Ligand binder design. Sequence first.
Ligand SMILES: O=P(O)(O)OC[C@H]1O[C@](O)(COP(=O)(O)O)[C@@H](O)[C@@H]1O
Ligand SMILES: O=P(O)(O)OC[C@H]1O[C@](O)(COP(=O)(O)O)[C@@H](O)[C@@H]1O
Ligand SMILES: O=P(O)(O)OC[C@H]1O[C@](O)(COP(=O)(O)O)[C@@H](O)[C@@H]1O
Ligand SMILES: O=P(O)(O)OC[C@H]1O[C@](O)(COP(=O)(O)O)[C@@H](O)[C@@H]1O
Lengths: 275, 275, 275, 275
Amino acid sequence: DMLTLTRELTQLLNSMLTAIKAISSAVKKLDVLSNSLVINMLQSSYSTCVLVSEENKDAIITAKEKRGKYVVCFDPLDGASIGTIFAIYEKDALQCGRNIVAAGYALYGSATLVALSTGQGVDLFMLDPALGEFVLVEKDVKIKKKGKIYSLNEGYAKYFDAATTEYVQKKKFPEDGSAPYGARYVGSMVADVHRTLVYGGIFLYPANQKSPKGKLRLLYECNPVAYIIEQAGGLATTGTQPVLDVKPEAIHQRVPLILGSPEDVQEYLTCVQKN
Amino acid sequence: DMLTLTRELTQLLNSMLTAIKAISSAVKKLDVLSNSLVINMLQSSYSTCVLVSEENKDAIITAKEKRGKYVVCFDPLDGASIGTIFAIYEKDALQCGRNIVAAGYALYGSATLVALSTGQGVDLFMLDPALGEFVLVEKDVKIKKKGKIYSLNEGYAKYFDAATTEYVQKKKFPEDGSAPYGARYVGSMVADVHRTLVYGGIFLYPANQKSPKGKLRLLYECNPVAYIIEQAGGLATTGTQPVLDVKPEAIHQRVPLILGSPEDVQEYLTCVQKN
Amino acid sequence: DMLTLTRELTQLLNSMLTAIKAISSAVKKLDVLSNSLVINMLQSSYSTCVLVSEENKDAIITAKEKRGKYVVCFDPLDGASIGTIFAIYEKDALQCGRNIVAAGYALYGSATLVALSTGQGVDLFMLDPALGEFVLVEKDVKIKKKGKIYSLNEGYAKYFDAATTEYVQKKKFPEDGSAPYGARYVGSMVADVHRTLVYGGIFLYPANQKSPKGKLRLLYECNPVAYIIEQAGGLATTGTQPVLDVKPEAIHQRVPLILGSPEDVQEYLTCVQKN
Amino acid sequence: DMLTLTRELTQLLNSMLTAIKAISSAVKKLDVLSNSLVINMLQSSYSTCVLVSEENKDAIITAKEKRGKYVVCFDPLDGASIGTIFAIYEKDALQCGRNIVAAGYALYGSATLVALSTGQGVDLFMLDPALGEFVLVEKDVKIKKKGKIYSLNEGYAKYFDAATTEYVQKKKFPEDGSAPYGARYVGSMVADVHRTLVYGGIFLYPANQKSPKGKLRLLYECNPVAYIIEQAGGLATTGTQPVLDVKPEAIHQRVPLILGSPEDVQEYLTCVQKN
Ligand SMILES: O=P(O)(O)OC[C@H]1O[C@](O)(COP(=O)(O)O)[C@@H](O)[C@@H]1O
Ligand SMILES: O=P(O)(O)OC[C@H]1O[C@](O)(COP(=O)(O)O)[C@@H](O)[C@@H]1O
Ligand SMILES: O=P(O)(O)OC[C@H]1O[C@](O)(COP(=O)(O)O)[C@@H](O)[C@@H]1O
Ligand SMILES: O=P(O)(O)OC[C@H]1O[C@](O)(COP(=O)(O)O)[C@@H](O)[C@@H]1O
């Protein structure tokens, strides 16, 4: 019942974590609050030059007094089961996801949880609010090759393209005498993606008739989780190419998102190719 | 930035709340732990004679030393977004839901939340862990007449009966030029029911081919939430009769559960009648 | 086991309280940290023009962008049993204590406690960290007419003046067949003063040979607690005049402090007069 | 900003710690509450046969169902700055302190702190309430050879024996041109002893005219802290022999307590010998 504790890009990550700490205890003026917490704590790290936020139309240039080498694209507050999303890399904020040096998300649940990766796999952390610090609870998290959960808003079935319609059909009526997958959809991305990571399976927000480029945002929603998910041995596709290979044409560009267990995503891609 | 605090069946409810407090900070040996916490704190209130638990095969008779007039059926730990469910009333534990004097649930999220009702509407509470007490955050909660969210596991589509198949079809393809409903399904009952209460709409765990009597348990899952939901102006049906009117034929009896906004549930019932 | 919560100078006090909240969870770079927390949260209230801090040589003038009518003298971190002290009123910071509109202290113990007064008695509050707000636990706190505790550093006995020597002698060897007083001295002012308020008795940091003007600071140590203590029905003297009547001749001026139950302080004054 | 955690007598200590956890968040029916928390958690460890409590007249024999090899003498709640004290070893509870296998105290401050020793020095712990576990913050704590603080209730000066009178005189008026010691006396033993450990110096509750055997209790006040203090390189005497060498003649026997920096206690003993 007794324990011991053991401990510029590093600088940046500690500040993002501190903002996540702050955001956590504060959990729509809340959107505003959490937004400025990130902006300001990020701008005190002396390691940023350009920030991209889901809450600001244009990129936020760090004054040279406090300027450093990294670029941070974030969604300060996404969605209980609310989240924060970020990736570290105005032209400097339009890099494809493959240039990501670091990224992660926090999920504000019964406990505040952080998935983090700097290119050598994914680590899961838990905010110890008493200590005011993040505790490692799992190293190098790896996703199942194949799961049994599919996760999308089926209320858009009327707007689905053929591939999505087909893939969902295969999940409910496997033509191979196997059990249908279970369905789960919280409707908060961080929460659905995090379940997908630890339990396995697939999460989709594809293009549909009413959102032809999907809903979720490339720079600070899709690219970050795609990075996390791939570092855990999964896949993240738009349906036509890996999310991390999209070349951003605007900082609030949307893309389709399909990610998860690699064999599930590969099954989806098969449905797309064969139309 | 300053506040003032203001304050036998009552006895029973404080003990259930205390167990919920304990359960909350402890959040599969966890199932065992939470179970005994309820049993023992309930048996110290000197107000129970018969307990029914999701974790115990048979009813748990209170010794006469500590015996009182009420009967408690509970699910100590259901399912982040885990919950606890209870209703207050061995033959003494097989009453139909209409004899309920009190019931509620807790949802262990970013905050621990309790929906409670003693027959005069529903009150929402928040556990103040610092104070170690529950704070009123909303009185007489009322559900929307009609919502725009439907919530069920569609991975069972292959096992759905005709009415369910039909109703889900109507939600995606409204034949009235209205928008399709949105879908949400966390897969934890307390979490799905609680969303249904505050946002409106409908939650279904109907009978299907593989679970012909549904999955959820009458005494300490379905009856409790049916009570909460009706006290908030909603409906809770098995498809053929109000949940609270089922006459229990066994303490772990299952029933179908459809509940929520009354006009949504009434639409469902229409689909059942007309088959 | 259930509760309800009920709710420009007001603005200023909420910000001081917020800084006390922040200081509380952060509890010598700590001195620096707590200092800036007060300064900055006070300067965001748009209600200050001049701040005086124990940590800054000179007064801190609020820019006109954020300027308001009140002056705040504070000790951000005094001294477990650490505290924060403040009074609300550069010439504008050299007012005698009688111009005080509001003052108080926080004591960071097992719980964070605030004694507060705006001229109509003293109220005691407890920081509810979960709620992030201060809860009233006692209104109009009144001190005993006479106590049985005396509190000073007797390790300075060799430096005491005659009156102090005499008074301490009378406490140990009452010449009236009454019990000697008990002694208590934590060595943190907020902690010793707070005990004096709730239990009664007397607290002394008189002049001595090595500190001829006493040790404690008039503007943000002595004046504040003198205000609190008098609003609770006590006295606060330098030995020659009420603390709140001293005319400040410098912002870090020291004065002797004797305060507490009025009959105890009056006994002390008798010892001074008769030398 | 990220951390990793690393982990029958052992059994007993974890349960004592758990009770300290419980006691901590509950911080005179409080005396009663904390008492039963210790008794019951100690009796669930299956490692005790005889308990001695400050709150129970007679020793508390563990039923054989749950009987083990160790004996625990404790003060569940002593005295903010409240504490809990215990030593591990009815005849089985009257052993001299030298048979102690383990002992410690908790101090319930701004943080809950535990000093612990099992014969190989003293370790300091901090309760991490979030983790619900105790974190090591300092290993093998060692006390100063000599301090500059003396700590006793001088309101008993009229009842002091000659040695105490003399020693206190030497502290205020050093006959060697050295500074007088500072005085500190919180009046809660755990708090005064803990300050003595980390800052150095001496703490006294000697015999006086009105308490000829001192006030503090041998089995669960004096023996425990004497053990802690000696394991940190200090001394603990009654004035005539080491506390840990007293042979208990009753389970609520009192003894004088003088402890702290060894050279300070040795100075005191000199004053006793030479009368
Ligand atoms: O209700 P829908 O259409 O299923 O969309 C839910 C999605 O929208 C989101 O709330 C994101 O919206 P934003 O892009 O505005 O931040 C995600 O968290 C979630 O996956
Ligand atoms: O995965 P499914 O089949 O959708 O079922 C999920 C349901 O099962 C539950 O976990 C209840 O299961 P239990 O009856 O064993 O407690 C509910 O919380 C939830 O609504
Ligand atoms: O050790 P001493 O001389 O008794 O002084 C203790 C006093 O000094 C203080 O720590 C204040 O010191 P500062 O004036 O530097 O803030 C008080 O809290 C306390 O009453
Ligand atoms: O007021 P006094 O006479 O100085 O005594 C204070 C002492 O009494 C105590 O409160 C202990 O009393 P108990 O023996 O009844 O537990 C100690 O914590 C403290 O050191």
